[PDB]
Amino acid sequence: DNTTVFTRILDRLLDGYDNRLRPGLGERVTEVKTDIFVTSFGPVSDHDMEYTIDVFFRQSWKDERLKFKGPMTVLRLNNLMASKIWTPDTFFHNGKKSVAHNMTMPNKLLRITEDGTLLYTMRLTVRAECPMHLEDFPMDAHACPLKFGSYAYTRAEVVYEWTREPARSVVVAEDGSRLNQYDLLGQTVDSGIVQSSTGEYVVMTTHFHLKRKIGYFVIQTYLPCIMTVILSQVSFWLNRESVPARTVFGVTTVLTMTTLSISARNSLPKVAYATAMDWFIAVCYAFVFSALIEFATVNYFTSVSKIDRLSRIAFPLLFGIFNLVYWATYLNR
Amino acid sequence: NNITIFTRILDRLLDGYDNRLRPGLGDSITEVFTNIYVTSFGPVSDTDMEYTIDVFFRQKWKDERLKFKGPMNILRLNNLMASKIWTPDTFFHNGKKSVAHNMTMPNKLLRIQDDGTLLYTMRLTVQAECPMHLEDFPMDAHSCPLKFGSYAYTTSEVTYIWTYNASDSVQVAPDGSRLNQYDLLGQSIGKETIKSSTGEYTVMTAHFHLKRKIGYFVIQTYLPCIMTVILSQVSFWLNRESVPARTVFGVTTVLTMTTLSISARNSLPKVAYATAMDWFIAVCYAFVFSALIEFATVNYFTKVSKIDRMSRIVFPVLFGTFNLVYWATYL
Amino acid sequence: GNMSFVKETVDKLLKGYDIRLRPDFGGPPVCVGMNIDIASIDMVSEVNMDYTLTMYFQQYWRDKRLAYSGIPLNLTLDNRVADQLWVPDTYFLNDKKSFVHGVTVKNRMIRLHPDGTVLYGLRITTTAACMMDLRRYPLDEQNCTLEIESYGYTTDDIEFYWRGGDKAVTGVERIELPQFSIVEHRLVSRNVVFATGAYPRLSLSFRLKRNIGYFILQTYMPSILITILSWVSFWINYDASAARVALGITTVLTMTTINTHLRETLPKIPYVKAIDMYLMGCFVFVFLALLEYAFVNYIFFGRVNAIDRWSRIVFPFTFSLFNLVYWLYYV
Amino acid sequence: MSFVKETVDKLLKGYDIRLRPDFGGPPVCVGMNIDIASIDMVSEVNMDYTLTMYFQQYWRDKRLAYSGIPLNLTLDNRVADQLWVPDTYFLNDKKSFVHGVTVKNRMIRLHPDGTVLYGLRITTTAACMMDLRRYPLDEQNCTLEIESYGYTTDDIEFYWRGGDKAVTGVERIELPQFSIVEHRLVSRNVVFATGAYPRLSLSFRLKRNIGYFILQTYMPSILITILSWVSFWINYDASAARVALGITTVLTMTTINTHLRETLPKIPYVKAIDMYLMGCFVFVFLALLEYAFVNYIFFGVNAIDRWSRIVFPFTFSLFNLVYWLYYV
Amino acid sequence: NIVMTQSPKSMSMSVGERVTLSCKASEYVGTYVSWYQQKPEQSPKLLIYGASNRYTGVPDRFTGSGSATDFTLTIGSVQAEDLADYHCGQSYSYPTFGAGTKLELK
Amino acid sequence: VQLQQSGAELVKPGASVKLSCTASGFNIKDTYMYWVKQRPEQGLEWIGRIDPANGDTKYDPKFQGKATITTDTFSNTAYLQLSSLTSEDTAVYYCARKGLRWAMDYWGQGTSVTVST
Amino acid sequence: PEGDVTVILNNLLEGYDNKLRPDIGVKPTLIHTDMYVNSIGPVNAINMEYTIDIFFAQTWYDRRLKFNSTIKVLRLNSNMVGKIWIPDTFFRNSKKADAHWITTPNRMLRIWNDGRVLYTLRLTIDAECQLQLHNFPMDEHSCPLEFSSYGYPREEIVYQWKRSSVEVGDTRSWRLYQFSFVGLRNTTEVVKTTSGDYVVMSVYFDLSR
Ligand SMILES: *[C@@H]1O[C@H](CO)[C@@H](O[C@@H]2O[C@H](CO)[C@@H](O[C@@H]3O[C@H](CO[C@H]4O[C@H](CO)[C@@H](O)[C@H](O[C@H]5O[C@H](CO)[C@@H](O)[C@H](O)[C@@H]5O)[C@@H]4O)[C@@H](O)[C@H](O)[C@@H]3O)[C@H](O)[C@H]2NC(C)=O)[C@H](O)[C@H]1NC(C)=O
Ligand SMILES: CCCCCCCC(=O)OC[C@H](COP(=O)(O)O[C@@H]1[C@H](O)[C@H](O)[C@@H](OP(=O)(O)O)[C@H](OP(=O)(O)O)[C@H]1O)OC(=O)CCCCCCC
Ligand SMILES: CCCCCCCC(=O)OC[C@H](COP(=O)(O)O[C@@H]1[C@H](O)[C@H](O)[C@@H](OP(=O)(O)O)[C@H](OP(=O)(O)O)[C@H]1O)OC(=O)CCCCCCC
Ligand SMILES: *[C@@H]1O[C@H](CO)[C@@H](O[C@@H]2O[C@H](CO)[C@@H](O[C@@H]3O[C@H](CO)[C@@H](O)[C@H](O)[C@@H]3O)[C@H](O)[C@H]2NC(C)=O)[C@H](O)[C@H]1NC(C)=O
Ligand SMILES: *[C@@H]1O[C@H](CO)[C@@H](O[C@@H]2O[C@H](CO)[C@@H](O[C@@H]3O[C@H](CO)[C@@H](O)[C@H](O)[C@@H]3O)[C@H](O)[C@H]2NC(C)=O)[C@H](O)[C@H]1NC(C)=O
Ligand SMILES: *[C@@H]1O[C@H](CO)[C@@H](O[C@@H]2O[C@H](CO)[C@@H](O)[C@H](O)[C@H]2NC(C)=O)[C@H](O)[C@H]1NC(C)=O
Ligand SMILES: *[C@@H]1O[C@H](CO)[C@@H](O)[C@H](O)[C@H]1NC(C)=O
């Protein structure tokens, strides 16, 4: 009979409650105070322009119909009470397929303060859409957005706000750093109004600033392309009469240049414009023909040649000048 | 009229019925006589240690509460009545994922009889596990099992039993053959008790016997490895002084044996031991590397190598004796 | 007779049961004992940085509202009564995609003990996220955890403890991972603090070293034979230009295609692994051999036996020095 | 609308969904029609194909017969869970779904004699085991096996409503590589161990459009065979270049063989295309063996080189005439 | 910490012309930048809550423009009841304020 | 709606002062209380904030250990507490609440402190 | 809620049969259709398919939902959708499609006082688009999107484009990598099938590589 007190409270609150109507429908606006706790920022799939994020999407509003007077003040209730009351229909504007986890029970909680304040947090994974400008790849940065707001309620029906200060309203957990390629720098939030045919809606935008780490692409693309150019430029140190020997340097370096040219764009999307890695490849693709037509010049004119005695110095020089000016203009942007 | 008679009978029975209590819960033990119609045996994926099977799992028990006395003998009802009465919780202990096809309506059958006998049968797509030991690869002959039993009821509350002879209770189907790499030899069943954390459980098991057909790996792995060895032995038949031609032979064979070594160990599990397939390529690669070295000793001793002339006899008969030992040990 | 008494007792137990209220709602927190029977740990993928685990997740609390004194035996009800009783909202924090098996029915167990003790067991296949440090790949070890936590109930409402001490997790000694091997398993009980309060947490963690012999059979032995293959060029005479250039170029191309083929099944990590260090060292050695031939061809044909004898001695000695450094630092 | 509503209430007051129509009497007759939208694809790795179709069943309940209203009422699909529907189930299904966007894609039109017009939009990944012994010049026979699960012939009886004209859509469906030559309808009566159950069978015959394989594999395989005979024109003392041709050809042949057989399942028999590549590999290996043997006969010639320059294009064309007249 | 600079310090114009205030933050503040007036020996009030969002009761001549860093307050026609200095605040972090900008009439 | 503060006071340096801000027309438990320092002929300066739902209080870094706020829900009034006040802190103290977009919409009439002889 | 909004909704759903379309035996139900495309996703050339994300909005009249009060518009959430009649609009060339469900199923339901009903939902469609490979990769396509009612024939439901039938977004963060959005053209027709004549609305998207 000790739990019959709390049973009579909850059956009284739901008695006459209409869950199809927002609180304060004819009097005021339903202020929904929200904040996000990011448990783990998941991997960013640069091929499909998207990022996975696992959040603790907390929301809080005020309902004056769910006021109670009892032996406690906060009602840490079960999950199925939340479907029997009004909840905001917050959806993500740039989501693509977000899952609400259900193992083992549905991962939601609902707390009802005695004055009518509610808390209602959800555990979600959100596969959002992050439009990126892969021009400076792989030395590029991206502010992947996450925009959420009400769906059926206009800015004269449900306005959103942050619970704490906007600096302290999106918190990223320290252990959750599931990015392997990028690097999370910080987060910034904002609020604004969007325009639609149905009306004006309050949107809530946050931006996650990411910087790509280039340590993968150095040891996969940049170093083997540099070693290919040096492998092409050692052909000037041989003799003129070794015609089958120097054409092996000529053919296989430009054939391993064009395989790396193909295989460096497989992870990229089908981008129409040219990235900064494509500029490094195509210039390095130009030195290996410049070594190849140098050999075709000296084979046509076949003592040591003045062409090989000049290309032994100029070819490592102009490759060094390009390498000095390419890294300076892109690592210091 | 006749529909109204059958409606009264199906109601009367559901009245006062509780589906939360097993038949004979406080008076005895429910026996669930089981069988399996293997309509089709799904492919035996080897790179995950699992197989697929499509069964028509039939279960049969007695419920004393469901005894009718009407103008019928069996009541061939639909799927809806199955969820309102007690059905046994059989599950597959080795199952990874299963598909209960519900298109266009749930593929289940229920058939209460007059004396209380109930025939419940579903259509399943059990993707059960199969522990593989690829130490005799690819001449392995696995026996992929299928273990199923109750989940919540212990041998003091539900004992399973194969219906007909233990021999002909798991029947397979003539046309049903999705197996490409292997072929079905035979099936054997059993009945054991597993003592888990919550008590003893009657576990029904059935082992399907398999045998890998060698013919896929002959064409793509064995014959390419053999033919490049024969190709590598062409280098003993050329002139001594033709230095770049015998160098091409070697540098190319060695490269294609490494390429075959990478490619043959693909769509295979990442096992910690060495297969008999890996014990063929490594010996095949040893031969090639040695013939290239034989050439390096020839080019070091230049200015016809009696060594070259002995290498045209010793090297082919050493590969022939190795092929005789390898394919008599494993075959 | 007995079945009707069990029926009326179950009806008495479920008449007025408020599922929205936890047991001892206005008083002390309820204690939830837990034990896990792990069936098999599935694929452990370094690409998606996760692992698939299948378990027998069982919980253990004591609800005073479900106490009965008439039946002298443990009541094992049908699994659909679990939606009419209070269960804790246990969730896994590092979960990605998990499901309860639904063939033939929903695989869950319910068992009411006569002291109101509630036994709730599920068969859960989960895909827990496990961040991996691949700095010593493939000689590395990993620490993969499964983070069990209550969601809605704080430490003033619920309590978690491993039931049976260190004997709660059973079955880890029988699992056979194809690539890894389970070294140790550990159980941790914590109290984490969030912005909404303090919540209990139980952590199950395994230590997974990697069985290395697949990598010797796959990458390390093909990488080391090319390094042997590059030193055949020292035995060839200096005037045979095409053979030495072809051998050096094919060894460089084999090294770089082994490097590009290996790093395509790994995620885009920004640091360098141990295996990438080994292949880069072998690439440096092959490049130094080709530079040695280029130096010889520049000295003789642009301006020999002493250099060729010296490089034939130093290069096998220095590469074995690299092998002794690498295999004693990473092991 | 008052009368229509009081009707859809009388008709559904007392409707026992657990009982089929004419439960104690003769079997019901579920007439069926399949409007194939498009065969999504036909894979040979998983040995299945995807059939998107507008399934439509046709039977006659009499507890669903209305009189006053003179129209074919089309109720919402939400009524399909309150009326009896037949238990048709495709037997070769491996996975299947009914689009629920924007609402369940089902249709329930109760004609005025109790006839129930129930139609769905299903997408089955039916299983179709293929014999690839004549790949890629082969033809395949893929079936979709329809049948009642719980009701025997004495309880249910199916039929192709409209006979041959009941599987419309087939002529226009257009898989990318195959071409639907024919579609035949069969009314089987399979017998399992529980009873005789009625079955309707829809089967297509799919020959393979071959020109992609000429553009992909056959023409690259035949030019390497032409490429190996350039070595007969080269002089015998030029050892390096001739071995170069030979090794590229044998390495090109074996990498074409390993690259082709990676998109096929691990079948234990030999296909026609594998026969063609093995014949080309035999011809190439033979040419390199030939130059090496010339080298020896000399170094351990012109008559042999002229003879092999004549026989090899003649014998390979003999192989081409045998292969393209036996498999076509 | 956040600092706000209001430029200039003071200016003098007549009735009925254009004035453009300036307020620049040290780092990123999104939209929560508030404009407060201070009539002498009275209490401050609110002009624009957020950026470019007019409060209730203030005239339509007051308008603002928002950005990441720089924020302007614009009055189309200065009237005789606007004898107050205008303070620019921020609220994306713990709130801070500028020095204000006085004005006078001829 | 209406925000009320008490009248001005004369205090000696080194003493302690008590200042109140009474709110009417709205409860304190849902909106923050903002207090701000307004020196003469100078800009504003925020000193601290109040969350009355849990008693959370965060101060300005400059005024740490200088000011203290208690808030009574029953009295509908929040209180100042200046422990170690000096003669330099001669200004007017304003009362404010959190507005629609974290602004300060409703303001009190302001109380001026005077530390002299 | 004030009480009046509650007793309005209780009056509108008592005696309401959601299994019967409005004007079942009088006149065909006229449905106006609106669409707002968010982003056209990747165009899979190997599968002849493309992904589209739209805000599908439909408007019709239900004489049974007429109420006389001072409240003009009943802006409701998604929980009223399953209680009232909804047209069975399905996409004819959709291989796979789904709505969004988190936090709450993304549905809008607004009811005016004269019986005008607005129903809006967010959908993602993997539609089928024909792709010619002649002159590839210099080609132009018209990727279609056909939708109709599944069950109700032409004499039961008649569709009709709204003034802004199709509205595009920014068209700068779109995933049109190979192509560029040239233009759109809305059309309508009547197809004849075995179950009757159906009104089909079509949207064509001009894509040029
Ligand atoms: C065959 O079995 C399956 C289960 O294996 C049955 O699927 C259930 O179908 C019903 C009716 O649609 C669903 O009930 C609704 O679910 C709504 C939310 O559902 C979303 O989340 C589900 C869980 O992930 C998901 O399955 C579902 O996808 C389905 O609908 C999509 C849009 O209609 C469609 O694109 C998908 O392909 C798929 O069909 C949604 O994403 C909820 O809002 C409703 O109120 C209602 O509850 C069940 O949830 C489905 N069950 C599951 C777990 O999938 C199917 O009906 C059976 N078929 C028969 C009986 O013929
Ligand atoms: C990529 C460069 C493409 C250049 C394309 C254009 C290249 C071009 O114009 O080459 C002509 C000439 C070739 O000189 P190189 O030394 O290669 O060739 C010598 C030349 O042919 C002499 O005439 C020969 O002497 P002889 O009279 O027969 O007895 C001599 O033979 P021998 O003495 O051994 O018997 C040959 O070796 O080079 C220049 O004049 C320098 C141009 C530098 C150009 C700038 C270079 C950076
Ligand atoms: C795998 C091979 C490993 C080899 C390892 C090392 C093998 C090794 O050390 O062999 C030495 C020798 C090399 O024979 P090979 O024919 O290559 O070299 C001859 C040899 O150098 C003679 O001494 C020379 O004659 P001479 O004295 O100047 O008058 C002769 O001069 P020429 O004819 O050019 O004018 C050379 O050709 O062969 C054997 O003794 C039989 C070995 C049978 C080996 C059978 C096969 C194993
Ligand atoms: C995998 O890594 C986790 C850490 O990320 C390891 O968990 C740690 O385990 C140790 C040993 O039990 C814990 O230390 C203990 O802390 C309690 C705190 O009161 C103390 O009383 C004990 O005496 C002991 O020092 C440590 O807290 C725990 N850290 C966590 C959970 O964050 C885990 O052991 C690793 N896996 C394996 C297989 O080693
Ligand atoms: C694909 O293969 C199936 C067999 O696996 C073919 O089905 C067969 O079709 C023939 C022609 O209709 C059937 O023969 C008929 O049998 C009845 C039996 O009474 C007889 O009365 C008729 O005169 C006729 O002979 C045969 O039974 C049937 N076999 C089955 C269904 O197992 C099918 O035709 C093939 N597909 C195509 C497109 O040809
Ligand atoms: C998520 O979990 C909830 C709770 O376990 C599931 O809700 C149950 O759904 C069944 C089928 O509709 C109902 O009969 C039960 O009454 C529901 N509640 C409970 C307490 O069991 C829900 O179906 C799950 N969703 C998914 C994706 O499966
Ligand atoms: C197409 O859209 C326009 C704009 O709403 C509309 O006026 C017209 O009726 C629609 N019908 C056509 C042309 O298919």
Three-state SS across E38-60?
ECCCCCCEEEECCCCCECCCCCC
Answer whether D115's CB lies under 8 Å from D50's CB.
Answer: no
* Residues with Cβ within 8 Å of residue G142, at least 6 apart in sequence: G185, G204, G205, G206, G207
User: What is the distance between the alpha carbons of residues A238 and E69, in angstroms, rounded to a whole number?
Assistant: 61
Q: Phi and psi dihedrals of G50, rounded to 5?
A: -150, 155
Token couple for A100: 């609400």
> Which atom from ligand 6 is nearest to the alpha carbon of A102?
1
The helix or strand, by DSSP H or E, that contains position C52, with its residue range, turns out to be strand C50-67
Determination technique used: cryo-EM
Set of chain A residues whose Cβ sits within 8 Å of the Cβ of E92: 165-167, 189
Residue ranges of E strands in chain D: 28-43, 48-60, 73-75, 88-90, 106-110, 115-120, 122-124, 139-148, 156-160, 178-188, 199-208
Half-sphere exposure of D184 (CA within 13 A, CB side): 6
Using the Cα atoms of residue B187, residue B193, residue B195 and residue B198 in order, give the sign of their dihedral.
positive
Q: Which residue has the tokens 């012109």?
A: D302
* CATH H-level superfamily of A4-213: Neurotransmitter-gated ion-channel ligand-binding domain (2.70.170.10)
Ramachandran quadrant class, G202 (left: phi over 0; alpha: psi -120 to 50; beta: rest): beta
Ramachandran quadrant class, F110 (left: phi over 0; alpha: psi -120 to 50; beta: rest): left
- Asked if D23 reaches chain B (Cβ–Cβ under 8 Å), the answer is yes
Q: Which residue has the tokens 């074995």?
A: C320
Pairing verdict, β E45-48 and E35-38:
antiparallel
For D201, the 3-state DSSP assignment is strand
> Which letter does DSSP use for residue B191 in this model?
E
CA of D186 to the centre of ligand 5 (A): 7
| B81-87 CB contacts, 8 Å cutoff, 24+ apart | B81/B10, B81/B110, B81/B112, B81/D18, B82/B108, B82/B110, B82/B120, B84/B14, B84/B17, B84/B19, B85/B14, B85/B17, B85/B19, B85/B110, B85/B118, B86/B19, B86/B21, B86/B22, B86/B23, B86/C78, B87/B59, B87/B120, B87/C104, B87/C105
Cα of D241 vs its chain's centroid, Å: 48
Q: For chain A, give every residue range classified as CATH 2.70.170.10.
A: 4-213
User: What is the distance between the alpha carbons of residues F19 and F85, in angstroms, rounded to a whole number?
Assistant: 13
Residue of B nearest to D240 (CA): B245
Answer whether A256's CB lies under 8 Å from A119's CB.
Answer: no
Closest C-alpha among D250, C115, D192, G198 to residue B55: D192
* Residues with Cβ within 8 Å of residue A192, at least 6 apart in sequence: A202, A203, A205, E31
Token couple for E61: 């001549």
> Which letter does DSSP use for residue G78 in this model?
G
* Ligand with minimal distance to D93 CA: 1
Other Cβ atoms within 10 Å of E49 Cβ, number:
23
Using the Cα atoms of residue C37, residue C42, residue C45 and residue C48 in order, give the sign of their dihedral.
negative
User: What is the distance between the alpha carbons of residues E62 and C61, in angstroms, rounded to a whole number?
Assistant: 64
**According to the annotation, is A58 in a ligand binding site?**
yes
Q: For chain B, give every residue range classified as CATH 2.70.170.10.
A: 2-210
Residue of B nearest to C126 (CA): B96
User: What is the distance between the alpha carbons of residues C157 and F63, in angstroms, rounded to a whole number?
Assistant: 39
Answer whether B268's CB lies under 8 Å from B240's CB.
Answer: no
* CB crowding A137-156: b at 16 or more within 10 Å, else e: bbbbebebbbbbbbbbbbbe
Answer whether A89's CB lies under 8 Å from A99's CB.
Answer: no
Boundaries of domain holding F21: 2-115
- Asked if D295 reaches chain B (Cβ–Cβ under 8 Å), the answer is yes
CB contact under 8 A, A237 and C294: yes
The helix or strand, by DSSP H or E, that contains position B229, with its residue range, turns out to be helix B223-232
* Protein residue closest via CA to atom 14 of ligand 7: G187
- Asked if C293 reaches chain A (Cβ–Cβ under 8 Å), the answer is no
Q: Ligand 4 pocket by C-beta < 6 Å: which residues?
A: C 143, 145, 184, 186, 188, 203, 205-207
Strand partners, B237: none
The helix or strand, by DSSP H or E, that contains position C325, with its residue range, turns out to be helix C305-329
The helix or strand, by DSSP H or E, that contains position B199, with its residue range, turns out to be strand B199-212
Number of domains in chain F: 1
Answer whether A57's CB lies under 8 Å from A33's CB.
Answer: no
Three-state SS across chain A?
CCCHHHHHHHHHHCCCCCCCCCCCCCCCCCCEEEEEEEEEEEEEECCCCEEEEEEEEEEEEECCCCCCCCCCCEEEECCCCHHHCCCCCEEECCECCCEECCCCCCCEEEEEECCCEEEEEEEEEEEEECCCCCCCCCCCEEEEEEEEEECCCCCCCCCEEECCCHHHCEEECCCCCCCCCEEEEEEEEEEEEEECCCCEEEEEEEEEEEEECCHHHHHHHHHHHHHHHHHHHHHHHCCCCCHHHHHHHHHHHHHHHHHHHHHCCCCCCCCCCCCHHHHHHHHHHHHHHHHHHHHHHHHHCCCCCHHHHHHHHHHHHHHHHHHHHHHHHHHCC
The helix or strand, by DSSP H or E, that contains position D243, with its residue range, turns out to be helix D239-260
Taking the domains of chain C in order of start, what are their residue ranges? 2-210, 213-329
CATH architecture, domain defined by D2-209: Distorted Sandwich (2.70)
Helix, strand counts (H, E) of chain F:
0, 10
Query: Judging by beta carbons within 10 Å of its beta carbon (0-12, 13-18, 19+), is residue D100 exposed, middle or buried?
Result: middle
Q: For chain B, give every residue range classified as CATH 1.20.58.390.
A: 216-329
CA distances from A301 to A240, A297, C276 (A): 9, 6, 44
- Indicate the class that CATH gives domain C213-329: mainly alpha
CATH topology of domain A216-331: Methane Monooxygenase Hydroxylase; Chain G, domain 1 (1.20.58)
3-state helix, strand, coil split of chain B in percent (to 5) is 35, 25, 40
Binding residues of D, by number, are 87-89, 147-149, 192, 194
User: What is the distance between the alpha carbons of residues E36 and E96, in angstroms, rounded to a whole number?
Assistant: 12
Half-sphere exposure of B201 (CA within 13 A, CB side): 21
> Which letter does DSSP use for residue D194 in this model?
S
Which alpha helices (DSSP H) does C176-304 contain, by range? 213-215, 221-230, 241-262, 274-301
- For the domain covering D212-326, report its CATH number: 1.20.58.390
CA distances from F108 to A319, E33, E42, E43, F25 (A): 71, 21, 10, 7, 13
> Which letter does DSSP use for residue G63 in this model?
G
> Which letter does DSSP use for residue C283 in this model?
H
- The CATH number for F97's domain is 2.60.40.10
> Which letter does DSSP use for residue C63 in this model?
E
User: What is the distance between the alpha carbons of residues D190 and D58, in angstroms, rounded to a whole number?
Assistant: 21
3-state helix, strand, coil split of chain E in percent (to 5) is 0, 40, 60
Cα of D208 vs its chain's centroid, Å: 10
User: What is the distance between the alpha carbons of residues E72 and E93, in angstroms, rounded to a whole number?
Assistant: 20
User: What is the distance between the alpha carbons of residues B204 and B202, in angstroms, rounded to a whole number?
Assistant: 7
Set of chain C residues whose Cβ sits within 8 Å of the Cβ of B95: 101, 103
Residue type, B189: I
CATH 3.10.450.50 holds for B2-210: no
User: What is the distance between the alpha carbons of residues D140 and D39, in angstroms, rounded to a whole number?
Assistant: 14
- For the domain covering E4-103, report its CATH number: 2.60.40.10
Query: Judging by beta carbons within 10 Å of its beta carbon (0-12, 13-18, 19+), is residue B141 exposed, middle or buried?
Result: exposed
Upstream peptide bond of C104 is cis (omega within 30 degrees of 0):
yes
> Which letter does DSSP use for residue F30 in this model?
T
- 3.40.50.10490, 1.20.58.390, 3.20.20.70, 3.30.2350.10: which CATH number matches B216-329? 1.20.58.390
For D159, the 3-state DSSP assignment is strand
For D199, the 3-state DSSP assignment is strand
Token couple for B128: 């059960």
C-beta of G161 in contact with ligand 7 (< 6 A): yes
Q: Longest C-alpha distance within chain G, in Å?
A: 67
* CB crowding B53-63: b at 16 or more within 10 Å, else e: bbbbbbbbbbb
> Which one of C57, C245, C253 has the shortest CB-CB distance to A245?
C245
Answer whether B228's CB lies under 8 Å from B253's CB.
Answer: yes
Token couple for A104: 């083992």
Three-state SS across A243-304?
HHHHHHHHHHHHHHHHHHHHHCCCCCCCCCCCCHHHHHHHHHHHHHHHHHHHHHHHHHCCCC
Closest C-alpha among B96, B49, B21, B26 to residue B270: B49
Instruction: Give the CA-trace dihedral at B164, B170, B175, B180, to 10 degrees.
Output: -160
Answer whether B59's CB lies under 8 Å from C35's CB.
Answer: no
Q: Which residue has the tokens 């966007």?
A: D101
Using the Cα atoms of residue F74, residue F75, residue F76 and residue F81 in order, give the sign of their dihedral.
negative
Residue of A nearest to G165 (CA): A197
User: What is the distance between the alpha carbons of residues D289 and C236, in angstroms, rounded to a whole number?
Assistant: 26
CA distances from C258 to A75, B288, D259 (A): 62, 20, 18
Half-sphere exposure of C21 (CA within 13 A, CB side): 21
For C303, the 3-state DSSP assignment is coil
**According to the annotation, is B58 in a ligand binding site?**
yes
User: What is the distance between the alpha carbons of residues D202 and D163, in angstroms, rounded to a whole number?
Assistant: 12
The helix or strand, by DSSP H or E, that contains position C329, with its residue range, turns out to be helix C305-329
Resolution of the experimental structure, in angstroms:
3.3
> Which letter does DSSP use for residue C174 in this model?
S
Closest C-alpha among F30, G11, G143, D281 to residue A28: F30
C-beta of B301 in contact with ligand 3 (< 6 A): yes
> Which letter does DSSP use for residue D232 in this model?
G
First-residue to last-residue Cα distance in chain E: 39
- The CATH number for G98's domain is 2.70.170.10
> Which letter does DSSP use for residue E101 in this model?
B
Answer whether A110's CB lies under 8 Å from A77's CB.
Answer: yes
* Protein residue closest via CA to atom 44 of ligand 3: B307
Q: Which residue has the tokens 């479900």?
A: C66
User: What is the distance between the alpha carbons of residues D62 and C161, in angstroms, rounded to a whole number?
Assistant: 62
Query: Judging by beta carbons within 10 Å of its beta carbon (0-12, 13-18, 19+), is residue D311 exposed, middle or buried?
Result: exposed
